[PDB]
C-alpha cells in the first residue's frame, strides 16, 4: 500500500430511522356519533379494511401494498 487520503467528497448522510411520530390512528372523532374514516382504505382481495391510504398531492397510496388507488372525483 501507499496511503489512504480518503479523497472523496463528504456525503455522510446516514438516514433517519423513521422518526417516532406523535399519537396516531386518527380515524375521525365524533361527539355522540359514529365515526367515519379519514384517509380512504382499499377494495383489495386481502386487506380487510384496516389499512389506510396516504393522502399525497394528487395521489392516494396504500402503505402495505405500495400501489396507488387514486380515482377521479
Smallest Cα–Cα separation from 39: which of 66, 61, 15? 61
Pick the stretch among 1-9, 19-27, 36-44, 52-60 that binds Zn ion (CB under 5 A): 36-44
* Dist CA 28 CA 37 (whole Å): 6
Contacts (CB under 7 A) with RNA, residues 45-64: 50-57, 59, 61-64
Minimum separation from the CB atom of position 21 to Zn ion (A): 20
Does 34 contact RNA by CB under 7 A?
Answer: no
Cα 26 from Cα 31, distance rounded (Å)? 14
Binding site for Zn ion (CB under 5 A): 44, 47, 51, 62, 64-65
Amino acid at each position: 500500500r501507499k496511503k489512504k487520503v480518503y479523497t472523496t467528497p463528504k456525503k455522510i448522510k446516514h438516514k433517519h430511522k423513521k422518526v417516532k411520530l406523535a399519537v396516531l390512528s386518527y380515524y375521525k372523532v365524533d361527539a355522540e356519533g359514529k365515526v367515519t374514516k379519514l384517509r380512504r382504505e382499499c377494495s383489495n382481495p386481502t386487506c380487510g379494511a384496516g389499512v389506510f391510504l396516504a393522502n399525497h398531492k394528487d395521489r392516494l397510496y396504500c402503505g402495505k401494498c405500495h400501489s396507488v388507488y387514486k380515482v377521479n372525483a
